[PDB]
From a paper:
The crystal structure of the SNX1BAR–SNX5BAR complex presented here, together with analytical modeling, revealed that SNX1 comprises a hydrophobic binding hot spot compatible with homodimerization and heterodimerization, whereas SNX5 uses distinct patches of polar residues to preclude homodimerization and enhance heterodimerization. The structure forms an antiparallel dimer of three-helix bundles with a curvature that would fit a circle with a diameter of ~32 nm. The interface buries a large area of 5,114 Å2, of which 78% corresponds to polar surface. Consistent with previous predictions, the central region of SNX5BAR has a negative patch, whereas the equivalent region in SNX1BAR is neutral.
The SNX protein family is defined by the presence of a phox-homology (PX) domain that typically binds phosphatidylinositol phospholipids (PtdInsPs), but may also participate in protein–protein interactions. Twelve out of the 33 annotated mammalian SNXs contain an additional carboxy-terminal Bin/Amphiphysin/Rvs (BAR) domain, and are therefore denoted as the PX-BAR or SNX-BAR subfamily. Herein, we show that ESCPE-1 has a single-layer coat organization and suggest how synergistic interactions between ESCPE-1 protomers, phosphoinositides and cargo molecules result in a global arrangement of amphipathic helices to drive tubule formation.
Author numbering:
A (entry chain C): 206 to 325, 343 to 404
B (entry chain A): 306 to 522
The structure:
């Protein structure tokens, strides 16, 4: 049964590029909060501009100063939500694959015990024939639970990014057309 | 006068506040561009993943996801640039405008000192005249006196020079305040539609991905 060798030879590449996608995901979320931090670092210098500014222009400007404060929070939502659905989902299957890879080693530990006892016991056979079934089921169950979780985590965010983008549209448009007709 | 000392203190302090705001954008533009790379590079990893995979339904959507981020780094690239060419250069050129009045106010008192530099040598011709008026010689009587009436009009000349430069900078300042009111309302709108187009295109990108996630069976 070459099912166990190929899955192991699949477990080595999927782990290495999931770890790659994991460190690149956190970088994308790290580089995101940086911009999100600047939106509050902008209004700090932007509010200090209307400190000595004409009366009619002061109101024209400060309305967008409040806008940036709101946009600092919304951008804080996506930077944090992506670490809960991408990196964490990617981080979860770094540790369980690390545990799934530990499941085959014990099967060999029952397989060389199968080969050690064959060149002579059934306890090295009843345990392996159980390990070739218990781990055979705990591994396939790990797939369906991973494919479903991959489908679910991709769903929750697509509905979130829709609300987030449609929110900011309902936030910027509340300010553009406010200026088109002052 | 005093209105000239007024429109110099705040402007220094205003250009300072104006210069302190341009610093944030230059780092914000650098941050978003850094994120655009950190997005395409991230997409370049979700594609090799979707390629290195045994499942088909996931490998399909995984590539369909890596393509979406490549559409975002471009939206990110356009965003940062439209933040630089349209907002940062809008600043870096307006502080340049404030540097003109910093030269005019310099030029205004460069003319005032020129007037005083005329009054500095005017008191000499009368002082030299006072010496050639006492001791016995009639030559320098009809020499330095001709120079007295000369500089007497020169200190009058530089004075009227200083008066008119003081006025042209007043019309120069007012020329800004009206052009600022009618344009800044538009100039601040000219920048927001870029964020609007980004958000609409951002939304218009995710709603196209949602069916590609339900298709997983
Ligand atoms: Pt000031
Ligand atoms: Pt690659
Ligand atoms: Pt002065």
């Amino acid at each position: 049964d070459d099912f166990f060798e190929q899955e192991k030879n699949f477990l080595i590449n999927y782990y290495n590029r999931i770890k790659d996608s994991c460190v690149k995901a956190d970088k994308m979320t790290r580089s995101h909060k940086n911009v999100a931090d600047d939106y509050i670092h902008t209004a700090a210098c932007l509010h200090s501009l209307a400190l000595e500014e004409p009366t009619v222009i002061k109101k024209y400007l400060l309305k967008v100063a409040e806008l940036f404060e709101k946009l600092r929070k919304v951008e804080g939502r996506v930077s944090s939500d992506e670490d809960l659905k991408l990196t964490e989902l990617l981080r979860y299957y770094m540790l369980n694959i690390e545990a799934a890879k530990d499941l085959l080693y014990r099967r060999t530990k029952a397989l060389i015990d199968y080969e050690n006892s064959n060149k002579a016991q059934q306890e090295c056979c009843q345990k392996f024939e159980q390990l070739s079934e218990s781990a055979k089921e705990e591994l396939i169950n790990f797939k369906r639970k991973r494919v479903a979780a991959f489908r679910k985590n991709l769903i929750e965010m697509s509905e979130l990014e829709i609300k987030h983008a449609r929110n900011n549209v309902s936030l910027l448009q509340s300010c553009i057309d406010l200026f088109k007709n002052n | 006068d005093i209105w000239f000392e007024e429109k110099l203190q705040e402007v220094e302090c205003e250009e300072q506040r104006l210069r302190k705001l341009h610093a944030v954008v230059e780092t914000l533009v650098n941050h978003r561009k850094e994120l655009a790379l950190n997005t395409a590079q991230f997409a370049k990893s979700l594609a090799m993943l979707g390629s290195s995979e045994d499942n088909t339904a996931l490998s399909r959507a995984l590539s369909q996801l890596a393509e979406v981020e490549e559409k975002i780094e471009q939206l990110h690239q356009e965003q940062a640039n439209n933040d630089f060419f349209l907002l940062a250069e809008l600043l870096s050129d307006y502080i340049r405008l404030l540097a003109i009045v910093r030269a005019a106010f310099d030029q205004r008192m460069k003319t005032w000192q020129r007037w005083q530099d005329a009054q500095a040598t005017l008191q000499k011709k009368r002082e030299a005249e006072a010496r050639l008026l006492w001791a016995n010689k009639p030559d320098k009587l009809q020499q330095a006196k001709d120079e007295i009436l000369e500089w007497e009009s020169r200190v009058t000349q530089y004075e009227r020079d200083f008066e008119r430069i003081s006025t042209v900078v007043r019309k120069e300042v007012i020329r800004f305040e009206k052009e600022k009111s009618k344009d800044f309302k538009n100039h601040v709108i000219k920048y927001l539609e870029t964020l609007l187009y980004s958000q609409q295109q951002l939304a218009k990108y995710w709603e196209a991905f949602l069916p590609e996630a339900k298709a997983i069976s």
